[PDB]
C-alpha cells in the first residue's frame, strides 16, 4: 500500500473537506460497506454513482432544489489506510456546495457509529 499522500493523487482537482471519518476496520472492509450503503441511497438523490473499487473511490453527484438554476455538487469519496486494522474516509468536493457534501459525510458517519466501527 503506498503512503496516503500517494493515494490522494487519485482525487480530481477540488477541495478536500477538513472533516474526515476514522474507522477501526481495514480499508477494504470500510469501502465494501460504503459501496453497499451508498448504492442503497440512490433513490434519495445520490446521482451518477461510480464505484472505483480499484482505488477505493466513490464518485457521484448531489443537486440543489432548483429546477431552473441547477447547482451540482460533484464529489469523490476515498477510503485510505490509517494504520494496522484501521482506515479513514476523505471527501473531495469538485464543484458546488460544501454544506451539501458535509451533510452526506455526517449521514455516513451516523451509520458507521451505529455499526460500532468508528475509531
PDB file of C-alpha atoms in Angstrom:
ATOM      1  CA  UNK A   1       0.000   0.000   0.000  1.00  0.00           C
ATOM      2  CA  UNK A   2       1.572   3.318  -0.938  1.00  0.00           C
ATOM      3  CA  UNK A   3       1.546   6.183   1.605  1.00  0.00           C
ATOM      4  CA  UNK A   4      -1.664   8.234   1.866  1.00  0.00           C
ATOM      5  CA  UNK A   5      -0.055  11.204   0.130  1.00  0.00           C
ATOM      6  CA  UNK A   6       0.440   8.970  -2.949  1.00  0.00           C
ATOM      7  CA  UNK A   7      -3.117   7.529  -2.727  1.00  0.00           C
ATOM      8  CA  UNK A   8      -4.583  11.038  -2.590  1.00  0.00           C
ATOM      9  CA  UNK A   9      -3.192  11.646  -6.131  1.00  0.00           C
ATOM     10  CA  UNK A  10      -6.270   9.763  -7.351  1.00  0.00           C
ATOM     11  CA  UNK A  11      -8.618  12.610  -6.406  1.00  0.00           C
ATOM     12  CA  UNK A  12      -9.595  15.088  -9.102  1.00  0.00           C
ATOM     13  CA  UNK A  13      -8.982  18.825  -8.747  1.00  0.00           C
ATOM     14  CA  UNK A  14     -11.188  20.114  -5.926  1.00  0.00           C
ATOM     15  CA  UNK A  15     -11.470  20.951  -2.251  1.00  0.00           C
ATOM     16  CA  UNK A  16     -10.750  18.198   0.266  1.00  0.00           C
ATOM     17  CA  UNK A  17     -13.071  18.655   3.250  1.00  0.00           C
ATOM     18  CA  UNK A  18     -11.460  19.009   6.635  1.00  0.00           C
ATOM     19  CA  UNK A  19     -13.941  16.564   8.117  1.00  0.00           C
ATOM     20  CA  UNK A  20     -12.635  13.004   7.966  1.00  0.00           C
ATOM     21  CA  UNK A  21     -14.218   9.822   9.265  1.00  0.00           C
ATOM     22  CA  UNK A  22     -11.915   7.377  11.093  1.00  0.00           C
ATOM     23  CA  UNK A  23     -12.845   3.671  11.394  1.00  0.00           C
ATOM     24  CA  UNK A  24     -11.442   0.692  13.319  1.00  0.00           C
ATOM     25  CA  UNK A  25     -11.707  -1.746  10.387  1.00  0.00           C
ATOM     26  CA  UNK A  26      -9.425  -2.338   7.356  1.00  0.00           C
ATOM     27  CA  UNK A  27      -9.896  -0.036   4.346  1.00  0.00           C
ATOM     28  CA  UNK A  28     -11.157  -2.936   2.161  1.00  0.00           C
ATOM     29  CA  UNK A  29     -13.953  -3.634   4.691  1.00  0.00           C
ATOM     30  CA  UNK A  30     -14.785   0.052   5.074  1.00  0.00           C
ATOM     31  CA  UNK A  31     -15.039   0.512   1.332  1.00  0.00           C
ATOM     32  CA  UNK A  32     -17.118  -2.639   0.821  1.00  0.00           C
ATOM     33  CA  UNK A  33     -19.664  -1.429   3.395  1.00  0.00           C
ATOM     34  CA  UNK A  34     -19.677   2.089   1.959  1.00  0.00           C
ATOM     35  CA  UNK A  35     -20.287   0.757  -1.530  1.00  0.00           C
ATOM     36  CA  UNK A  36     -23.286  -1.266  -0.289  1.00  0.00           C
ATOM     37  CA  UNK A  37     -24.597   1.631   1.817  1.00  0.00           C
ATOM     38  CA  UNK A  38     -24.442   4.337  -0.848  1.00  0.00           C
ATOM     39  CA  UNK A  39     -25.764   2.126  -3.669  1.00  0.00           C
ATOM     40  CA  UNK A  40     -28.856   1.862  -1.440  1.00  0.00           C
ATOM     41  CA  UNK A  41     -29.177   5.660  -1.207  1.00  0.00           C
ATOM     42  CA  UNK A  42     -29.530   6.317  -4.941  1.00  0.00           C
ATOM     43  CA  UNK A  43     -33.280   6.985  -4.568  1.00  0.00           C
ATOM     44  CA  UNK A  44     -32.525   9.737  -2.044  1.00  0.00           C
ATOM     45  CA  UNK A  45     -30.717  11.962  -4.538  1.00  0.00           C
ATOM     46  CA  UNK A  46     -27.289  10.353  -4.967  1.00  0.00           C
ATOM     47  CA  UNK A  47     -26.828  10.596  -8.726  1.00  0.00           C
ATOM     48  CA  UNK A  48     -24.332   9.061 -11.200  1.00  0.00           C
ATOM     49  CA  UNK A  49     -22.645   6.838  -8.627  1.00  0.00           C
ATOM     50  CA  UNK A  50     -19.470   5.195  -9.844  1.00  0.00           C
ATOM     51  CA  UNK A  51     -17.639   2.736  -7.605  1.00  0.00           C
ATOM     52  CA  UNK A  52     -13.960   2.691  -8.428  1.00  0.00           C
ATOM     53  CA  UNK A  53     -13.276  -0.391  -6.345  1.00  0.00           C
ATOM     54  CA  UNK A  54      -9.669  -0.464  -7.602  1.00  0.00           C
ATOM     55  CA  UNK A  55      -8.807   2.831  -5.925  1.00  0.00           C
ATOM     56  CA  UNK A  56     -11.487   2.617  -3.203  1.00  0.00           C
ATOM     57  CA  UNK A  57     -13.113   5.724  -4.592  1.00  0.00           C
ATOM     58  CA  UNK A  58     -16.780   6.570  -4.952  1.00  0.00           C
ATOM     59  CA  UNK A  59     -17.805   9.360  -7.291  1.00  0.00           C
ATOM     60  CA  UNK A  60     -21.221  10.940  -7.600  1.00  0.00           C
ATOM     61  CA  UNK A  61     -23.471  13.967  -7.759  1.00  0.00           C
ATOM     62  CA  UNK A  62     -25.798  15.802  -5.383  1.00  0.00           C
ATOM     63  CA  UNK A  63     -28.192  18.519  -6.617  1.00  0.00           C
ATOM     64  CA  UNK A  64     -29.766  21.688  -5.232  1.00  0.00           C
ATOM     65  CA  UNK A  65     -33.554  22.147  -5.027  1.00  0.00           C
ATOM     66  CA  UNK A  66     -33.982  24.414  -8.035  1.00  0.00           C
ATOM     67  CA  UNK A  67     -35.245  23.016 -11.306  1.00  0.00           C
ATOM     68  CA  UNK A  68     -34.402  26.284 -13.105  1.00  0.00           C
ATOM     69  CA  UNK A  69     -30.941  27.178 -11.709  1.00  0.00           C
ATOM     70  CA  UNK A  70     -29.016  23.978 -11.067  1.00  0.00           C
ATOM     71  CA  UNK A  71     -26.002  23.671  -8.812  1.00  0.00           C
ATOM     72  CA  UNK A  72     -24.371  20.261  -9.000  1.00  0.00           C
ATOM     73  CA  UNK A  73     -22.279  19.166  -6.048  1.00  0.00           C
ATOM     74  CA  UNK A  74     -19.901  16.699  -7.687  1.00  0.00           C
ATOM     75  CA  UNK A  75     -17.925  14.710  -5.200  1.00  0.00           C
ATOM     76  CA  UNK A  76     -15.387  11.986  -4.683  1.00  0.00           C
ATOM     77  CA  UNK A  77     -15.043   9.865  -1.524  1.00  0.00           C
ATOM     78  CA  UNK A  78     -11.849   7.936  -0.924  1.00  0.00           C
ATOM     79  CA  UNK A  79     -11.111   5.273   1.657  1.00  0.00           C
ATOM     80  CA  UNK A  80      -7.481   5.145   2.837  1.00  0.00           C
ATOM     81  CA  UNK A  81      -5.472   3.078   5.267  1.00  0.00           C
ATOM     82  CA  UNK A  82      -4.961   4.577   8.718  1.00  0.00           C
ATOM     83  CA  UNK A  83      -2.529   2.180  10.429  1.00  0.00           C
ATOM     84  CA  UNK A  84      -2.939  -1.540  11.052  1.00  0.00           C
ATOM     85  CA  UNK A  85      -6.576  -2.562  11.319  1.00  0.00           C
ATOM     86  CA  UNK A  86      -7.781   1.000  10.641  1.00  0.00           C
ATOM     87  CA  UNK A  87      -8.972   3.244   7.812  1.00  0.00           C
ATOM     88  CA  UNK A  88     -10.431   6.644   7.124  1.00  0.00           C
ATOM     89  CA  UNK A  89     -12.703   8.407   4.681  1.00  0.00           C
ATOM     90  CA  UNK A  90     -11.852  11.670   2.889  1.00  0.00           C
ATOM     91  CA  UNK A  91     -14.284  13.850   0.942  1.00  0.00           C
ATOM     92  CA  UNK A  92     -13.283  15.813  -2.145  1.00  0.00           C
ATOM     93  CA  UNK A  93     -15.672  18.459  -3.458  1.00  0.00           C
ATOM     94  CA  UNK A  94     -15.112  19.003  -7.223  1.00  0.00           C
ATOM     95  CA  UNK A  95     -17.899  21.566  -7.602  1.00  0.00           C
ATOM     96  CA  UNK A  96     -20.839  23.031  -5.779  1.00  0.00           C
ATOM     97  CA  UNK A  97     -21.830  23.144  -2.112  1.00  0.00           C
ATOM     98  CA  UNK A  98     -19.551  22.407   0.845  1.00  0.00           C
ATOM     99  CA  UNK A  99     -22.624  22.320   3.086  1.00  0.00           C
ATOM    100  CA  UNK A 100     -24.323  19.687   0.883  1.00  0.00           C
ATOM    101  CA  UNK A 101     -21.286  17.403   0.833  1.00  0.00           C
ATOM    102  CA  UNK A 102     -20.668  17.783   4.575  1.00  0.00           C
ATOM    103  CA  UNK A 103     -24.298  16.704   5.155  1.00  0.00           C
ATOM    104  CA  UNK A 104     -23.655  13.469   3.262  1.00  0.00           C
ATOM    105  CA  UNK A 105     -20.494  12.935   5.326  1.00  0.00           C
ATOM    106  CA  UNK A 106     -22.495  13.375   8.547  1.00  0.00           C
ATOM    107  CA  UNK A 107     -25.099  10.853   7.391  1.00  0.00           C
ATOM    108  CA  UNK A 108     -22.417   8.252   6.566  1.00  0.00           C
ATOM    109  CA  UNK A 109     -20.881   8.848   9.969  1.00  0.00           C
ATOM    110  CA  UNK A 110     -24.222   8.142  11.700  1.00  0.00           C
ATOM    111  CA  UNK A 111     -24.447   4.712  10.087  1.00  0.00           C
ATOM    112  CA  UNK A 112     -20.813   3.853  10.911  1.00  0.00           C
ATOM    113  CA  UNK A 113     -21.392   4.889  14.515  1.00  0.00           C
ATOM    114  CA  UNK A 114     -24.459   2.649  14.747  1.00  0.00           C
ATOM    115  CA  UNK A 115     -22.486  -0.287  13.354  1.00  0.00           C
ATOM    116  CA  UNK A 116     -19.854   0.124  16.079  1.00  0.00           C
ATOM    117  CA  UNK A 117     -16.955   0.538  13.648  1.00  0.00           C
ATOM    118  CA  UNK A 118     -15.730   4.073  14.417  1.00  0.00           C
ATOM    119  CA  UNK A 119     -12.210   4.503  15.711  1.00  0.00           C
TER     120      UNK A 119
END
